[PDB]
Amino acid sequence: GSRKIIHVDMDCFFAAVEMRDNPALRDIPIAIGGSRERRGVISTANYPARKFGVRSAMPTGMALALCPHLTLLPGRFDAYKEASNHIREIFSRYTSRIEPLSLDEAYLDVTDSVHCHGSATLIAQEIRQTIFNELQLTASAGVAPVKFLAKIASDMNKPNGQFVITPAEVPAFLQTLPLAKIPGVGKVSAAKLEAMGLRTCGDVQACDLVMLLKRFGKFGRILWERSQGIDERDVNSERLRKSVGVERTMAEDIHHWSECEAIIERLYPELERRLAKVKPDLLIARQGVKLKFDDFQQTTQEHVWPRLNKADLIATARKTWDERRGGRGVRLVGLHVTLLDP
DNA sequence: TCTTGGGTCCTAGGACCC
DNA sequence: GGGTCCTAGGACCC
Numbered sequence: 163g164s165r166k167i168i169h170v171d172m173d174c175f176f177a178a179v180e181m182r183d184n185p186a187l188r189d190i191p192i193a194i195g196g197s198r199e200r201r202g203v204i205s206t207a208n209y210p211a212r213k214f215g216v217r218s219a220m221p222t223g224m225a226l227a228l229c230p231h232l233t234l235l236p237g238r239f240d241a242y243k244e245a246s247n248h249i250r251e252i253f254s255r256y257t258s259r260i261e262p263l264s265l266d267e268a269y270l271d272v273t274d275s276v277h278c279h280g281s282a283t284l285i286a287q288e289i290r291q292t293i294f295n296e297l298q299l300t301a302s303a304g305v306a307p308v309k310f311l312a313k314i315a316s317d318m319n320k321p322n323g324q325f326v327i328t329p330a331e332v333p334a335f336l337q338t339l340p341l342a343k344i345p346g347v348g349k350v351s352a353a354k355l356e357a358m359g360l361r362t363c364g365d366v367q368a369c370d371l372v373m374l375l376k377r378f379g380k381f382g383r384i385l386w387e388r389s390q391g392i393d394e395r396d397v398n399s400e401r402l403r404k405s406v407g408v409e410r411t412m413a414e415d416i417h418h419w420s421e422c423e424a425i426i427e428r429l430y431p432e433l434e435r436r437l438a439k440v441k442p443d444l445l446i447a448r449q450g451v452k453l454k455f456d457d458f459q460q461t462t463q464e465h466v467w468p469r470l471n472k473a474d475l476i477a478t479a480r481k482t483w484d485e486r487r488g489g490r491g492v493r494l495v496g497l498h499v500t501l502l503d504p
Numbered sequence: 505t506c507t508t509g510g511g512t513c514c515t516a517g518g519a520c521c522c
Numbered sequence: 523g524g525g526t527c528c529t530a531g532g533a534c535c536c
């Protein structure tokens with residue numbers, strides 16, 4: 163009993179929306195991120211700029227060395243939110259089984275769909291068309307019998323393409339597939355696996371589960387299953403935000419608490435406004451704060467608390483500021499809150 | 505070049521409880 | 523002594 167699962171993913175999402183809204187940006191290298199003097203990274207970049215080596219996560223310092231004519235934008239969320247909202251209403255036309263992973267991505271289970279003679283392929287195509295019409299924005303898709311393979315599949319023919327994997331093709335496909343392409347395995351993990359000869363799913367299939375469990379725990383079991391193309395996770399549609407927070411990174415580090423306090427003052431309204439959006443009474447399960455020093459270590463203190471409170475956050479922030487820091491600069495302060503349990 | 509801001513989920517020790 | 527809450531931290535994702 164195989165399911166038909168689609169992963170959709172908008173191409174170069176933030177940049178695409180900029181370039182839509184300003185055709186002049188179309189053929190020159192642009193990126194959304196915080197400027198160099200702001201100590202920012204790149205959020206995303208268009209293809210002209212990727213050409214040069216610009217990636218997401220890359221410090222803006224490096225983006226500009228690498229691509230000195232890089233036009234840099236601060237980004238417009240309402241515009242990204244608006245677009246997201248539309249793409250989702252578009253998915254809704256084809257199924258209710260929709261699980262968004264971020265503004266620009268969603269899984270659809272389309273198994274029990276009656277939409278295109280039950281052709282997953284035709285469905286993805288129909289959604290990539292209609293997203294283009296309607297948004298002037300391209301999207302790529304992956305189709306597969308499970309979440310992670312549709313995920314990997316949606317990258318394989320991007321931009322503005324799609325790619326299908328049938329159950330027939332799966333074992334071939336997993337044989338040479340590098341563990342790192344599996345969601346949940348990044349740098350650190352890949353490096354461990356490698357260091358013990360494991361690089362592809364292929365290699366994990368020759369592996370003893372008992373051992374994978376000894377040295378990664380619940381992660382070993384995931385690895386092991388995914389290697390076999392096993393992925394039982396259902397598209398759910400019911401997930402809710404569990405927390406919210408707000409953080410800022412100074413252009414220069416701060417060494418005096420007077421400054422730190424100044425920062426927090428500026429952050430609380432923002433974290434109040436966001437939380438009101440979702441909880442007018444301001445009722446939370448815990449609040450707390452976050453500091454990250456010059457040696458880039460980061461620490462957080464967070465306790466049970468019943469209702470967002472500016473003073474308490476300033477309080478605990480001073481404890482923190484005293485009791486852990488020992489004279490390093492401080493690059494960022496942030497606040498945080500954990501939503502009630504329902 | 506010099507390392508964001510918004511989140512998720514997993515681990516682990518000690519408190520607390522039957 | 524075996525679970526569950528509390529808190530801190532880390533790897534990961536977009």
Ligand SMILES: Nc1ncnc2c1ncn2[C@H]1C[C@H](O)[C@@H](COP(=O)(O)NP(=O)(O)OP(=O)(O)O)O1
Nearest residue numbers: 171172173174175176177205206207218219266536
């Ligand atoms: N590390 C990061 N930090 C901040 N914002 C980020 C980010 N990574 C992504 N974003 C924001 C900006 C991104 O536009 C958006 C979507 O994330 P993707 O789908 O991973 N990347 P995109 O759609 O840009 O390129 P592709 O064509 O390969 O899909 O999330």
Ligand SMILES: [Mg+2]
Nearest residue numbers: 171172173174
């Ligand atoms: Mg995308």
Ligand SMILES: [Mg+2]
Nearest residue numbers: 171266267536
């Ligand atoms: Mg994405």
